Amino acid sequence: VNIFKAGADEERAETARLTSFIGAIAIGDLVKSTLGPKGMDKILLSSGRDASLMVTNDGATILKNIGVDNPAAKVLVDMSRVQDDEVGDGTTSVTVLAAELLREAESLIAKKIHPQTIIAGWREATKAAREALLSSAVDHGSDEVKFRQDLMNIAGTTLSSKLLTHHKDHFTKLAVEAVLRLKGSGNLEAIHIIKKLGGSLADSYLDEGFLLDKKIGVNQPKRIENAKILIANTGMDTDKIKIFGSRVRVDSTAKVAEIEHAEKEKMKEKVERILKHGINCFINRQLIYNYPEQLFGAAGVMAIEHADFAGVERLALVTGGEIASTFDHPELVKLGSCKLIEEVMIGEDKLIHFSGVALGEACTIVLRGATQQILDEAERSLHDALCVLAQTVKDSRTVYGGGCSEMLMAHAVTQLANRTPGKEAVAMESYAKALRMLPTIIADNAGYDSADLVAQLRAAHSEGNTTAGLDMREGTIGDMAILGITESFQVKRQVLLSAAEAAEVILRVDNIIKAAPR
């Protein structure tokens, strides 16, 4: 008998199961093409935004901008987004990996075993795997040679998936140096990522110093050398007033006349207070009135206004200056100092150059290239590429990729699958088998015959060659240590852990119910 309002649903444990799995399978197979060193990338277009469209390779954004109704899928989309905010790529991996779980798990539904068991064994199976992974990690501490050596190895692995892949060596240095410029700070915001059309992709780079996309004031010096720098947030164009809003009531225009003047003196002395710092460069995120600027021009002192907090962070980071206010104690405030500021023109615009910077703490990467989406996705690539890169600094331990490690886990479970004996062992098989599908998919998009290679790759790991991996430029097994196909342990850990949970939730449900949409 009808219970809910019209437009409400109740699917119980067969229809509920299937549809959850169907879209999930749709999620996976829609995106499998995009990961793998020989993977592809997708194009996303707005319904109507004058075709706000994005060619994209990262599934998370691919997941981000796709509207899907399957609630279980929306779980996965958010699931990756967490991972995306975790490591950026492998969203590629994580989602598709979780799918094969689901696809294969459904097979056992055909096998008709209580899923409560499936949770248990995989949970057990996972427990062995993450430990098994942990047993395979590699550290490199003060070994700056090998550390920095491997550090670039990590990048290209992450990078040899996006459109920039034809220039991996180039950007490898870029990210490396920039990341080292972070000096153990992880704040990616310390790196600005300036994009502008024009130039080849290869022409993109990172400045030795800093650049700014703002306008100079009135005819202040365009170029400044051995610069003294000041940063503030004290508004000038917004004349400094007394927030409560006192009136000014006067009998005579003389009184207001002098007051306009009085404000002028009030304004003027404030600058001379600024100037008392003996600083030839000043900046503010505030818009600054031109009259004080004329006083600055009267000083022959260059200044820039209205550069938002983020760059201000960058400037303070790169120069060590302390963004300040009211400047009352020049000795108690440390300025910013740089060797040179000059105006350099790029593409179509003059950009604000900061040569000879005090601190390499902040940085900004020049992006020359071909397409908004190219520049956009190139932007998308690096931010994640740095994203792993910082955690690599954060946790300087590594694992070899190229599917091999994942196979090591599967083999480990394959063994524990036997110490199981029971129904769970089947799920142990299922879990391990699903993992082996991932590199198969990679070999798939590489167009080589996966079937033998995984079987052979299983053999060597079953033999014990934990470093034998997969060739992505010739399609065979190989020594990743020789080939540097490595990545963060934390990455694949979250990869495994999150999918494991994702598996848990997707199975545990046995009825979906949709309210009538408003």
Binding site: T234, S325, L497
Partner: protein, 197 residues
């Protein structure tokens, strides 16, 4: 409250941020706030925890009744002009004179005052949620002052450790309070891979 046989769950702060594993989820004998420093230049950690709790924002006080001053002469502006930063000097000394080390305010700041507040190595939190502030006070044993003048060392909050947490790999951060003495309040921090989880 064994003596009462009860407990108000308001004393409990449920807090889960997505990310990381499930087992990372942890109780915190303290408070975590969805807030970082008022000024980014402020140091990330604090060992000592001389803590201040006020509701008055760091601005010229405005008696909320319909009120406005009537500046007429130059010196009227001048003495007014004088008082503005003179007023900010006042609370600046007042808090510094309290001997405190870290502060928290319910509302926003004046950037000029904010900079000055950094200028004596006194980190703080502004625009801080109501209960949360109260969670701090009971956690630190501190009180809430509506004034600087009535604020003294006795009402100051204390804790073992406070350190803002860059929990998000590419997201903005959080701040947590490792009070170490007895706390009638405590918070639980939850982490995991899915929002629904």
């Amino acid at each position: 409250d064994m003596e009462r046989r009860d407990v108000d769950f308001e004393l409990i702060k449920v807090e889960g941020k997505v990310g990381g594993r499930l087992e990372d989820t942890k109780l915190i004998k303290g408070v975590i706030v969805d807030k970082d420093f008022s000024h980014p230049q402020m140091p990330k950690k604090v060992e000592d925890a001389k803590i201040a709790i006020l509701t008055c924002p760091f601005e010229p006080p405005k008696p909320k009744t319909k009120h406005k001053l009537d500046v007429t002469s130059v010196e009227d502006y001048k003495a007014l002009q004088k008082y503005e930063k003179e007023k900010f000097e006042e609370m600046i000394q007042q808090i510094k004179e309290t001997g405190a080390n870290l502060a928290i305010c319910q509302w926003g700041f004046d950037d000029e005052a904010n900079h000055l507040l950094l200028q004596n190595n006194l980190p703080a939190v502004r625009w801080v949620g109501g209960p949360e502030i109260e969670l701090i006070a009971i956690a630190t044993g501190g009180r809430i002052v509506p004034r600087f003048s009535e604020l003294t060392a006795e009402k100051l909050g204390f804790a073992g450790l406070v350190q803002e947490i860059s929990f998000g790999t590419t997201k903005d951060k959080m701040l947590v309070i490792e009070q170490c003495k007895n706390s009638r309040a405590v918070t639980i921090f939850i982490r995991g891979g899915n929002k629904m989880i």
